[PDB]
């Protein structure tokens, strides 16, 4: 769990990129396959 902190702190650090690859996708869709790949 003290490696699996600085494993969270990585985490945490890729989650908030993928969160905001979600919303960028969200918003491609928004703007067929591309909406399903979306």
Same mark, same amino acid.
């Given at each position: 769990?003290?490696?699996? %902190? &600085?494993? %969270? &702190?990585?985490?945490? &650090?890729?989650?908030? $990129?993928?969160?905001?690859?979600? *919303? *960028?996708?969200?918003? &491609? $869709?928004?703007?067929?396959? *591309? %909406?399903? *790949?979306?």
């Amino acid at each position: 769990q003290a490696i699996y %902190l &600085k494993e %969270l &702190k990585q985490s945490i &650090k890729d989650f908030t $990129n993928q969160v905001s690859i979600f *919303r *960028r996708d969200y918003e &491609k $869709n928004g703007p067929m396959e *591309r %909406l399903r *790949r979306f």
